[PDB]
Design a protein around this ligand. Structure first.
Ligand SMILES: *[C@@H]1O[C@H](CO)[C@@H](O[C@@H]2O[C@H](CO)[C@@H](O)[C@H](O)[C@H]2NC(C)=O)[C@H](O)[C@H]1NC(C)=O
Ligand SMILES: *[C@@H]1O[C@H](CO)[C@@H](O[C@@H]2O[C@H](CO)[C@@H](O)[C@H](O)[C@H]2NC(C)=O)[C@H](O)[C@H]1NC(C)=O
Ligand SMILES: *[C@@H]1O[C@H](CO)[C@@H](O)[C@H](O)[C@H]1NC(C)=O
Ligand SMILES: *[C@@H]1O[C@H](CO)[C@@H](O)[C@H](O)[C@H]1NC(C)=O
Ligand SMILES: *[C@@H]1O[C@H](CO)[C@@H](O)[C@H](O)[C@H]1NC(C)=O
Lengths: 305, 305
């Protein structure tokens, strides 16, 4: 029957095989296994029949191995897989034919250079994708690459080499994290249709300009992080926007702030109250800003200068 | 109201904060968090208040951070904690006052140089301990250090500088893994009392001698891995042992094999049948072994020369 690899721990539907220097995926594991942890081993590839009889596996952890090659439909048998963690490996591209039940994919710190729309089509359960720390470029991501995922709620591409915000992002998105890349500008086209986006993380990039109408394309944005960039003015549209509440702009090159940069002409009862605004580490000093500039901020501690 | 940290994903009692470069344990997390994943961040230390209100947390993952200091009882508030993974950090010692409910401790790949018995006193729920890849030396391990774990079933100390098998191991142990260290001899005193031991892993060490009566101290041993050592002869006591079934001796310096090395005088129906014996990559050649040497092995394929 089922065998437990020497040194591994097989207890209650869990197969713990971490830190053992394994050179390949062990076979003959208990059929009812629900979580297989192969973290920190020395696996180089996932052959076509590495996961047979693991119909009940919902979590697969392959973090910190040496995987550089994965056979198509290698995860085909994992008909109940919900989490696939492949972070800290040597993947050049994302694997094809991932279980349709997949809810989360993490490929942080690999060698991904290209992202095709083909790899994601059909994945209607995906809610979270993390692609940070990869030598990926904007040209490497196809327009509409994440389009095929009807339920995608969170996407994070951080510490890569992308220079623009990917185009054709799934409208179901509520959080878009692109911190620590090489983005130089925010264009309204890339944010078109993001009706449910609530959080936008663009900190630690090289953004110098934010096109007019960008923020309007994310009508319900609540949190906007643009700190540690190269802005020379507060992005436009904040005064008209009705849902924005947190705007971090510290560590930029803003030297002036108009009286209508955050708040509309007088008082708009329809515009939500700012709960946080950061402006420290910018050329502008508190003494160069009319007090009225923050009239629509009643919580004094909300602004940091 | 509980707050989910920016970029983290908080869903179904699970707080996912991996790969974010966090410099410290986030706070104000959902009181009902069952699992906290802070893997691959830049956390340098765990302060006394870091884990308050996490009374229902059963799993804490701090793997792959830069932790090099932990406050006593810092984990104390984690009264339901069952798993604590501290692997790939910079600990010099094990933490004190760990949740008495703890069933598994993993501290692989750290900088531990000393192991105090005081750390395990009271951990009566602890079933698995992993302390591999540490500069640890035999002098750094107190006698009966793991003595306090009345229920400990598995312990692995691999790839360290220990040269001898720790003394005063809990008799409840079913698995003892000491693969990849610098152990030179197997003394009977160390294995004394281990009546429940079923697996003994000593491969990849510097073992040249196995004291007589060693195996007799592990009467129910089923699997013995002694491959890749410096044995000159097959360890004694195998013929009188009744439970031993797997004996890996490949990759050693054994020059001869007597007729009573594995099998006893005739046929002891009370002795378990071998299912796996490896002797390849040894000075001895297959034609130098007398056929009757494996009389008590009926599944020919079991032996690998
Ligand atoms: C972003 O791209 C640059 C340039 O391709 C990467 O830096 C180079 O990395 C190569 C290895 O692939 C080195 O041999 C070169 O010396 C680097 N070039 C320069 C000009 O420094 C960089 O690693 C990429 N960033 C990420 C996060 O992948
Ligand atoms: C295998 O065992 C033999 C002993 O039969 C080892 O021989 C030793 O060799 C060294 C020189 O390298 C001598 O100084 C010792 O006196 C020898 N030992 C004995 C007991 O005579 C041999 O080195 C071993 N082979 C390996 C690869 O370790
Ligand atoms: C953006 O809005 C500001 C103020 O309404 C305006 O001065 C600027 O010209 C606008 N940008 C463009 C490209 O028209
Ligand atoms: C900030 O803007 C001013 C005026 O445009 C420019 O002189 C200065 O070099 C900028 N600072 C940085 C760090 O780019
Ligand atoms: C063992 O200690 C020595 C110093 O005595 C050191 O050079 C070596 O790296 C250590 N090995 C391990 C596995 O910790």
């Amino acid at each position: 029957g089922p065998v437990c690899p020497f040194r591994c721990q097989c207890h209650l539907r869990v197969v713990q095989c971490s830190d053992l220097g394994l050179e390949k995926v062990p076979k003959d594991l208990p059929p009812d296994t629900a979580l297989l942890d192969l973290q920190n081993n020395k696996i180089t590839e996932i052959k076509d029949g590495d996961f047979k009889n693991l119909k009940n596996l919902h979590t697969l952890i392959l973090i910190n191995n040496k995987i550089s090659k994965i056979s198509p439909g290698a995860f085909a048998p994992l008909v109940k897989l919900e989490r696939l963690y492949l972070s800290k490996n040597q993947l050049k591209e994302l694997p094809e034919k991932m279980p349709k039940t997949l809810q989360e994919l993490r490929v942080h710190e690999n060698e991904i250079t290209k992202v095709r729309k083909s790899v994601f089509n059909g994945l209607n359960q995906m809610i979270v994708v993390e692609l940070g720390t990869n030598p990926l470029k904007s040209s490497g991501i196809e327009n509409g690459a994440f389009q095929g995922m009807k339920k995608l709620s969170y996407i994070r591409i951080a510490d890569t080499n992308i220079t623009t915000i990917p185009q054709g992002l799934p409208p179901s998105l509520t959080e878009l994290h692109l911190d620590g890349n090489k983005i130089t500008k925010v264009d309204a086209a890339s944010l078109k249709g993001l009706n449910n986006l609530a959080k936008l993380g663009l900190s630690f990039n090289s953004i110098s300009a934010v096109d007019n109408g960008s923020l309007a394309n994310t009508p319900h944005l609540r949190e906007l992080h643009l700190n540690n960039n190269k802005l020379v003015k507060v992005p436009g549209g904040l005064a008209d926007h009705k849902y924005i509440q947190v705007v971090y702009l510290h560590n930029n090159n803003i030297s002036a702030i108009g009286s209508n940069d955050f708040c509309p002409p007088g008082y708009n009862t329809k515009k939500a109250s700012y709960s946080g605004v950061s402006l420290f580490s910018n050329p502008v000093q508190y003494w160069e800003i009319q007090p009225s500039t923050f009239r629509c901020v009643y919580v004094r501690a909300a602004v940091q200068l």
